[PDB]
């Protein structure tokens, strides 16, 4: 007779735990993101072998781009090349582009570590460096590593504000991330104020256990995930989010693979009645907002189905 | 003996309504958007205490940007600052940057309502207004409210074409939003033609009940939902969408929070061998295409499971 | 007594195949995309009835834009109009814009194939063709078909690298598309190596049976699906992706509809203290990364529910 109560207790435990009498609806969301703060750059680099001091300020129209869906990118490090005009000129001398005669590199080929098509004229580049000229935007941007001190090293002091509006299409529920009547001056913390939406780059990077400098030398991918477990029944009703953060990049730095996150941005202009462009190689962290969750509500068909299943189970148990 | 038929009737009702004999699969969709129409601007603004006239025309290359996934932005209002050179210059005098001596604002402190780093030497700015100069782009963008008449109030007179292509990966089904051989010169209405994809901005703004000449001042977020409910079984086969619109913005107008939807655009150029740039503070309505739906197909395993469940239920009912 | 074993065999088959004893969790993903390769353009065009030669080379900062979520765009063909000043000038003479008197077209009427607002002055434009001038950017970009040979016809030779990081928030599982210690230099193939993420545009276009040149005239929408079927149980544990491709565009080429994928890009500048802009109509294939999948783990409550259901089923079968 002990098993008769045991199966009843187990069914009650299952029903209380998994909420099998609850119909679950998916999430439909919309994310708004605002990045504040300004940065100050002051350092020196070696452009083409010549020392050059780069100093100035960056406001919220420089280190960012208009949001693409639910994500946002932040400038961290950049390599600048200016005064590029289209024409024939020798490339940066590497192992694969070096030559001693026109026989080595032939016209029409396209190496995967070079831009343009070479013509097969192995001429001296600089200080008796024989490379064959390529058709591209002169001067070709010499491939160099990112500076050891991060240019946008103050990016850990920036602030971000995230507004989330989730919907449940099965039911008549749409809710927001910010309840009306709460303070706006705050800083997120796992213990002090979980509900605080304002994050800080230093804090989110420290939570994952990675230092900002190493992750920012070449950039990476970061992810803020928001879990929405909401009970829409009349009793014990709550719809509140939980925030966590994870590194979305493999963090391997393989030579064959492509470490971090980077791209090239080209700005065009016309001067002296000829077109020209400036190229910035950009390494920065891209933050992805991953919002997910479920919404539960009371339904009778699923409850009846589960009741029938557990009735069959306990009847079979009572049979033997 | 009435219950012995009541249970069967309720089981049949549940099977017919909830479609428990139908395996369900989620949605994989794709959105293609094209916005047309032109806008004419003719108004007067007050910049730096001087009255200026802004007149001209914007076409589809102006008031929008290339689509970012399933979303599109429309320019509605802008504040322009032209001719910024980078250096030390006084900022806009607020209630926190004023001074009576250099000691009011320290050197190196980063204020949350100022772009640049003040140096700690506060001098007059205009009409004997003492502020401490910051190292930023000059002249500093004048903090002012958006003009009371919308510079692009004709934005409500626009048309947008949306093509949706959804898939059901579990089954073999990929369908579109528009069928072949139908008219393409129409206007969406809830009763006249639900299948019309061309959405007039005035129509979508009036369906929700919010006047266009109010949210256009600071922008906003709107969500267009294309709900799909397709029965992929051979019998009673139909797969058609239903369009709905909602306001995805809080619309609380909180001073502490950031109402509307605004961002800063920066355009760089070079004049007299000096790198300058132009700022445009942009307010506009960002439209989101929220697409969701579940595809249903007849399956034997779920039918058998539900049959067993109702067998248990009505057997228990017959027992007592 | 044969049915007694038959129902048990059917239940076992259903459990083994449909994996009803397995709890399924949805997918939370992130996509990183890198596009390599360079293009060379050398052709002749007819602008304003005059022959011109377009020659140059485009690198990875020209034929693309920064990634917008899980998608990326590639330039394929462009029509350029340089040096536009904003003022009153005649438009392109078409059927709906031609006139013989000022009364044919009235001021303030916005036709739906036009950029600008006419003032009602039917003046000569070229070869004694009378049209009423509109207020817009001049010269107005003449409407013409794209050149028959694609300008970026070499775009089919480009390579794209895709990195996928999928998550299962229900469980403790976050995995990646590329495993560590695997060769990077490779080309994707269904039989040779289906795990290589490096996709070739020519290869993917040929896989779907559509020639690259034909769809490159007006562009299109491409869809790459990554399907994940991962079993998280300790036994028979495997979680690897499968790659599929299809065309996301209707490919109807209806005159009323809008064939292909295209958009207008405007680049602003200042010359002689006058603001001018350059317009580029762009046709190109937009690639979408549709990633989806499910994660299966071992759970006891679903197993018990299905066990009870089959208990009722075979008990009813044995009853009659
Ligand atoms: C040292 C270094 N190396 C870079 N790339 N190295 C590649 C890239 C591709 C291939 S492969 O032929 O496809 O296998 C092989 C190599 S390898 O030299 O490491 O062997 C880049 C990125 O430059 P790009 O954006 O122009 O690609 C940067 C940027 O800063 C860099 O500092
Ligand atoms: C009146 C007005 N006010 C604005 N912002 N007001 C803020 C912003 C932040 C903070 S806080 O310190 O973070 O708490 C407090 C305030 S408060 O003055 O309302 O108290 C902006 C936006 O300007 P930004 O884009 O530069 O932020 C505009 C734009 O038009 C505006 O017209
Ligand atoms: C031949 C041709 N035709 C184009 N458009 N044709 C339209 C567009 C709209 C309407 S409708 O009034 O809305 O029904 C009717 C027509 S129709 O002439 O085919 O009947 C475009 C695109 O030009 P836009 O981007 O300026 O729209 C291009 C671009 O190359 C083109 O080559
Ligand atoms: C961030 O700001 C605080 C404010 O006092 C300052 O102490 C700290 O040095 C700053 N960190 C960086 C990296 O600039
Ligand atoms: C907000 O913070 C201030 C000081 O930081 C405090 O005085 C106030 O009680 C808080 N709550 C509200 C609702 O203002
Ligand atoms: C929109 O266009 C119609 C077309 O005639 C016109 O009557 C109406 O006044 C316009 N409204 C606005 C706000 O431009
Ligand atoms: C489309 O609309 C036109 C007039 O707007 C009408 O004459 C025609 O019958 C409609 N249907 C088709 C298939 O053209
Ligand atoms: C693609 O590159 C290969 C490399 O040899 C070349 O043979 C082929 O002609 C190229 N195709 C196009 C369309 O440029
Ligand atoms: C990778 O490819 C190279 C040649 O393409 C081959 O020699 C090597 O064995 C492969 N595997 C590894 C792990 O390098």
In angstroms, the separation between the Cα of residue C183 and the nearest Cα of chain B is 30
The kind and range of the H/E element at B313 are helix B300-319
Find out whether B27 and B295 touch, Cβ atoms under 8 Å.
Answer: yes
Ligand closest to Cα of C179 equals: 9
A6–B contact, CB cutoff 8 A? no
Give the up-direction half-sphere exposure of residue A246: CA atoms within 13 A in the CB hemisphere: 18
Cα pseudo-dihedral B142, B145, B150, B156, rounded to 10: 110
In angstroms, the separation between the Cα of residue A301 and the nearest Cα of chain B is 7
What CATH number is given for C23-297 in this structure?
A: 2.60.490.10
Which residues, judged by CB distance below 6 Å to any ligand atom, belong to the binding site of ligand 4? A 153-154, 156-157
Residue nearest to atom 32 of ligand 3 (CA): C145
Ligand closest to Cα of B117 equals: 4
Radius of gyration of chain A measured on its C-alpha atoms:
29
Radius of gyration of chain C measured on its C-alpha atoms:
29
Token couple for B116: 């640049």
For chain A, how many helices (H) and strands (E)?
4, 16
Residues in C touching B162 (Cβ below 8 Å):
none
Instruction: Using alpha carbons, select from C164, C186, C204 the residue that is nearest to residue C285.
Output: C204
104-123 of A, contacting C, C-beta below 8 A: 110, 112, 115-117
Residue nearest to atom 5 of ligand 4 (CA): B109
Euclidean distance between CA atoms A182 and A161, whole angstroms:
14
B176–C contact, CB cutoff 8 A? yes
Euclidean distance between CA atoms A306 and A20, whole angstroms:
7
Residue nearest to atom 3 of ligand 9 (CA): C183
Q: Which of A69, A258, A264 has its CB closest to that of C68? A: A69
Find out whether B191 and B60 touch, Cβ atoms under 8 Å.
Answer: no
Residues in C touching A250 (Cβ below 8 Å):
163, 165, 176, 178, 180
Residues in A touching B254 (Cβ below 8 Å):
180, 184
Experimental method: cryo-EM
Q: Which DSSP letter does residue B217 get? A: T
Ligand closest to Cα of A182 equals: 5
Which residues, judged by CB distance below 6 Å to any ligand atom, belong to the binding site of ligand 7? B 183, 185
Resolution (angstroms) equals 3.6
In angstroms, the separation between the Cα of residue A2 and the nearest Cα of chain C is 19
Q: Which of A68, A110, A248 has its CB closest to that of C165? A: A248
Q: Is C157 touching ligand 8 by the criterion CB < 6 Å?
A: yes
Instruction: Please indicate whether, in this complex, the C-beta atoms of B66 and C73 are within 8 angstroms of each other.
Output: yes
Burial of A303 (0-12, 13-18, 19+ CB in 10 A): middle
A62–B contact, CB cutoff 8 A? yes
Ligand 7 atom with the smallest distance to the CA of B183 is 1
Which residues, judged by CB distance below 6 Å to any ligand atom, belong to the binding site of ligand 1? A 112-113, 143, 145, 255-256; C 184-185
Pocket test for ligand 6, best of B39, B41, B157 (most atoms within 8 A of CB): B157
Sign of CA dihedral C212, C216, C221, C226: positive
Instruction: Please indicate whether, in this complex, the C-beta atoms of B163 and C269 are within 8 angstroms of each other.
Output: no
Domain ranges of chain A: 4-22+298-320, 23-297
Count Cβ atoms below 10 Å from residue C65 Cβ, excluding itself: 20
Ligand 3 atom with the smallest distance to the CA of C79 is 30
* A-C contacts (CB, under 8 Å): 107
* B-C contacts (CB, under 8 Å): 108
Positions of E strands within A103-200: 117-124, 130-138, 159-168, 173-176, 199-200
Q: Which of C110, C249, C312 has its CB closest to that of B308? A: C312
Per-position DSSP letters for B44-84, written without gaps between them: EEEETTEEEEEEEEE-TTTS-----SSEEEEEEEEEEEEEE
Residues in B touching A62 (Cβ below 8 Å):
266
Pocket test for ligand 9, best of C178, C180, C183, C198 (most atoms within 8 A of CB): C183
Ligand closest to Cα of A193 equals: 5
3-state SS string over chain C? CHHHHHHHHHHHHHHHHHCCCEEEECCEEEEEEEECCCEEEEEEEEECCEEEEEEEEECCCCCCCCCCCCEEECCCEEEEEEEEEEEEECCCCCCCCECCCCCCCCCCCCCCCCCCEEEEEEEECCCCCEEEEEEEEECCCCCCCCCCCCCCHHHHHCEEEEEEEEEECCCCEEEECCCCCCCCCCCCECCCECCCCCEEHHHHHHHCCCCHHHHHCCCEEEEEEEEEEEECCCCCCECCEEEEEEECCCCCCCCCCCCCCEEEEEEEEEECCEEEEEEEEEECEEEEEEEEEEEEEECCHHHHHHHHHHHHHHHHHHHC
Find out whether C79 and C281 touch, Cβ atoms under 8 Å.
Answer: yes
Residue found under tokens 């088959």: C13
Mutate which of C30, C270, C276 to disrupt the B interface (most B C-beta within 10 Å)? Answer: C270
What CATH number is given for B4-22+298-320 in this structure?
A: 1.10.287.940
Sign of CA dihedral C95, C99, C105, C110: positive
Token couple for B89: 């210059």
Dihedrals phi, psi of C2, to nearest 5 degrees: -65, -35
Residues in A touching C180 (Cβ below 8 Å):
250, 252, 254
Instruction: Please indicate whether, in this complex, the C-beta atoms of B312 and C310 are within 8 angstroms of each other.
Output: no
Which residues, judged by CB distance below 6 Å to any ligand atom, belong to the binding site of ligand 6? B 154, 156-157
Residue C218 CB contacts under 8 Å (≥ 6 apart), including other chains: C77, C146, C253, C259, C260, C261, C262, C283
Euclidean distance between CA atoms B291 and B66, whole angstroms:
20
Cα pseudo-dihedral B120, B123, B125, B126, rounded to 10: 150
Q: If DSSP codes are grouped into helix, strand and coil, which group holds residue A278?
A: strand
Positions of E strands within chain B: 22-25, 31-35, 39-47, 50-58, 71-89, 117-124, 130-138, 159-168, 173-176, 199-200, 220-231, 241-247, 262-271, 274-298
């Amino acid at each position: 007779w002990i098993f008769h109560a045991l199966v009843f207790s187990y069914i009650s435990f299952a029903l209380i735990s998994d909420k099998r009498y609850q119909k679950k609806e998916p999430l439909i969301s919309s994310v708004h993101t605002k990045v504040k703060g300004i940065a100050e750059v002051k350092a020196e680099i070696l452009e083409n072998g010549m020392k050059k001091m780069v100093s100035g300020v960056f406001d919220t129209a420089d280190y960012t781009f208009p949001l693409q869906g639910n994500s946002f990118f932040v400038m961290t490090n950049f390599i600048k090349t200016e005064g590029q005009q289209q024409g024939l000129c020798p490339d940066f001398p590497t192992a694969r582009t070096i030559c001693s005669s026109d026989r080595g590199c032939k016209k029409g080929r396209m190496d995967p570590q070079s831009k343009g098509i070479q013509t097969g004229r192995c001429v001296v580049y600089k200080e008796r460096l024989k490379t064959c000229e390529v058709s591209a935007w002169c001067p070709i941007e010499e491939v160099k590593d990112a500076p050891r001190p991060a240019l946008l090293n103050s990016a850990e002091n920036f602030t971000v504000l995230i507004k989330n509006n989730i919907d449940f299409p099965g039911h008549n529920y749409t809710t927001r991330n910010i309840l009306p009547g709460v303070n706006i001056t705050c800083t997120f913390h796992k213990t002090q104020n979980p509900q605080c939406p304002i994050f800080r780059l230093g804090d989110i990077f420290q939570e994952t256990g990675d230092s900002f400098s190493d992750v920012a030398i070449q950039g990476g991918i970061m992810g803020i995930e928001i879990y929405w477990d909401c009970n829409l029944d009349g009793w014990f009703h709550h719809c509140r989010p939980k925030y966590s953060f994870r590194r979305l990049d493999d963090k391997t730095t393989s030579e064959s693979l492509y470490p971090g996150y980077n791209f090239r941005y080209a700005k065009y202009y016309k001067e002296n009645n000829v077109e020209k462009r400036t190229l910035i190689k950009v390494f920065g962290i891209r933050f992805d907002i991953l919002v997910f969750g479920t919404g539960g509500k009371f339904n009778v068909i699923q409850l009846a189905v589960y009741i029938g299943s557990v009735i069959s189970y306990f009847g079979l148990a009572t049979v033997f």
